[PDB]
Write a protein that binds this ligand. Sequence first.
Ligand SMILES: Nc1ncnc2c1ncn2[C@@H]1O[C@H](COP(=O)(O)OP(=O)(O)OP(=O)(O)O)[C@@H](O)[C@H]1O
Ligand SMILES: [Mg+2]
Length: 223
Amino acid sequence: TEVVMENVTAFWEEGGTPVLKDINFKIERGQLLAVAGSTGAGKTSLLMMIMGELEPSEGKIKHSGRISFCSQFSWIMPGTIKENIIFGVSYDEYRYRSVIKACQLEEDISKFAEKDNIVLGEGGITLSGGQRARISLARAVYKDADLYLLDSPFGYLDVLTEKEIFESCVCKLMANKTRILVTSKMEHLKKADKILILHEGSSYFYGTFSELQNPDFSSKLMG
Ligand SMILES: Nc1ncnc2c1ncn2[C@@H]1O[C@H](COP(=O)(O)OP(=O)(O)OP(=O)(O)O)[C@@H](O)[C@H]1O
Ligand SMILES: [Mg+2]
């Protein structure tokens, strides 16, 4: 047991409608949990709760450990690509190199004369959205953390790159890590240990891929 939610309900608006209603799950160390559902279902809000940014109105959240969060929206601080990835933490050569490879940043870095020492301005608006997204993922995965919260880290990448990085980073590099991945792709759900499908704040499904089927679930993963 590393993350537990029991009977969790929450409101952003003090007197409005619940953003999450009666959420239940448990994640054990090293497991991959897929959190799926359409726009507005409550996926990011669920992560906010784990991070203590959204307090429950009822129920219990039990988690132990340092969180590393990859936001749905990429961000870039003033500094080099290297400094953005390392982000405070001490530099470990092997760790750094493996993350850069897993997030396909080798080819990008090589194209600048200053390499990963190129200086970016706040927002990194001279880079592409894909480049910023892969740096933001690299930043999250480089961190020594107990719980990795990855909020749609491939939403600004093409389908092939998404497949490749899901494999190289989430599946291979992070194989021993406790991961919560916001994603609705069938391939990703198939590889997850557990799946939570949210629909309009509620738990539409919680369980394994084999349970999911044996019916119309896939319609609830879209939009
Ligand atoms: N950090 C935040 N602070 C305040 N309100 C938020 C925050 N994140 C989400 N909300 C609000 O909570 C509600 C639930 O939406 P949420 O962002 O959790 O859905 P989601 O499943 O992440 O959607 P998407 O797939 O579009 O990213 C929305 O009304 C949203 O405006
Ligand atoms: Mg979201």
